[PDB]
Amino acid sequence: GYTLWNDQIVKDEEVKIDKEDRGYQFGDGVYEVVKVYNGEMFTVNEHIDRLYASAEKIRITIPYTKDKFHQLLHELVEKNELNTGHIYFQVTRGTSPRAHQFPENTVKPVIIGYTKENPRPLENLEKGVKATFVEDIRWLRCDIKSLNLLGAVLAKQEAHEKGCYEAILHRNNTVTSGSSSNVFGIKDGILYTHPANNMILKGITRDVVIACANEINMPVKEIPFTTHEALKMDELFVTSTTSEITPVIEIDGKLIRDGKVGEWTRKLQKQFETKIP
Amino acid sequence: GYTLWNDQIVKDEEVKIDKEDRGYQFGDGVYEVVKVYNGEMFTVNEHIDRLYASAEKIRITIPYTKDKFHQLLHELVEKNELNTGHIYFQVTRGTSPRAHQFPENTVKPVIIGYTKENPRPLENLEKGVKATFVEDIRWLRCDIKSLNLLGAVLAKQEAHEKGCYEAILHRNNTVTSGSSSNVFGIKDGILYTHPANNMILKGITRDVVIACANEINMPVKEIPFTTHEALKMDELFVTSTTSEITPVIEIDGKLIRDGKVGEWTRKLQKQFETKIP
Numbered sequence A, B: 001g002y003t004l005w006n007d008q009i010v011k012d013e014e015v016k017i018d019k020e021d022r023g024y025q026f027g028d029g030v031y032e033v034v035k036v037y038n039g040e041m042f043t044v045n046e047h048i049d050r051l052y053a054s055a056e057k058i059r060i061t062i063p064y065t066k067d068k069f070h071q072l073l074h075e076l077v078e079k080n081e082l083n084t085g086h087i088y089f090q091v092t093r094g095t096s097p098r099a100h101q102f103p104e105n106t107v108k109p110v111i112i113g114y115t116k117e118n119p120r121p122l123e124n125l126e127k128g129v130k131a132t133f134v135e136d137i138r139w140l141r142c143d144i145k146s147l148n149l150l151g152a153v154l155a156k157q158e159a160h161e162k163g164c165y166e167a168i169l170h171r172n173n174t175v176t177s178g179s180s181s182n183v184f185g186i187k188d189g190i191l192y193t194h195p196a197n198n199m200i201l202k203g204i205t206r207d208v209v210i211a212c213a214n215e216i217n218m219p220v221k222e223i224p225f226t227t228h229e230a231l232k233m234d235e236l237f238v239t240s241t242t243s244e245i246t247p248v249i250e251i252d253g254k255l256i257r258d259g260k261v262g263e264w265t266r267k268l269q270k271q272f273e274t275k276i277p
Ligand SMILES: *Cc1c(COP(=O)(O)O)cnc(C)c1O
Pocket: A033, A145, A177, A178, A179, A180, A181, A182, A201, A202, A203, A204, A205, A206, A239, A240, A241, A242
């Protein structure tokens, strides 16, 4: 298909990544994932705003405006005739002889974006998935959606090896987030999720879900909970652009309540549906 | 010049990295740097051993034996006619459709290696350098020499704009290591340095210096010290393959003792010098 390369759309075949691209030697870059429903991009403005925020946090200056970035994305979707799936795009500090410190400002960031056809996770959304607890060994700037993802890779692999969908991470016995999703817990009709600080990535789906809770008049409390408290929640689920609202019905052999998707998770899934294009 | 690409030596111009190389999307890989003195590789066996160990730690199976890998490096050095400088080589898990979990064991790792002529930093070895303290925000597996170097990148850049050579990192005031070097402190003829656990990379230069210390009968205590205690040291220096034994005479405007390279630091450099080709 076609790939967004810097400021132009070209056939995948024309893209050339240098061995000294800082994204390849230091994971020095940021990224975003946007879901596309039947040709329509979901919350694209919010994801673009976060790409710029992430880049700002590590001092990368994206060579062009958000408006232009949005236009390039539209083109990318049209040229690939993407129906339902997602757009992946990243920005690295650029190509320069290997050195940890920033290169001369005359070095242009490298932008890469492409699409992938991917249906909504129907089965998971209806039946829920299994998860496992994994100690959070990530760096202390999880608020940045960066390419330094080795911690997430090791966590997800451990989960997959155990036949689990996601790994629920914990730092000092406190549940932070999944390897690539935010975690929510419901207890006595109240929604709980770890607050948005450097310990987690402030997900767009996470913000949408919180808005949905307010819409159905459900109390929301952003205070963290421990692994012990998590196993005692009435309901539990994770969120991400591609997982939407996926119920977690069991963790390491221990069923969450009765092992079925709860009524509040269902109500939130219904409210979320009204938001989809 | 020529670049080592997998098991072939090709002209730099021919090397192409795929946008879905996991080293480019996750920093999913490991690397090593070997110094070359007058055409000879210094401690190459130790570096090859660590490359395989780092790789094993994140379950990447390098497809060639160490003897084969050693042969390729020798080949790479000859072809580029490298006299004095270093060899950089890394291995990533390979190219596969973007997914956090591991690809099925059929995807081969991507190996890249190249050279760079670069003289010994004689001026730094003789006059010493300035450093600055920076909170250690790195992930918890610093014992792996991986491509997830965004922490080191931000630290080094903060040091660079302060006119400093290296950033000495610390977790809750306990000194761990520099952004890309190990830190040693000397107090009353005794050598101090953080022990080798998951908080630091166990440097090969660090280990050679410790060997040098035993050879000149200088006591060594591998126990960590604080940023406050570091400032009260008689001597301080950092080590790395490219920095060798580089004295730190000043930290954040505060001289180490008198701001001059110490007697023991000189003795260690003298013993070290007997080790290089
Ligand atoms: C991207 C990401 C999420 C989810 O954010 P969304 O905008 O909802 O996709 C959650 N956790 C981590 C660690 C992430 O990187």
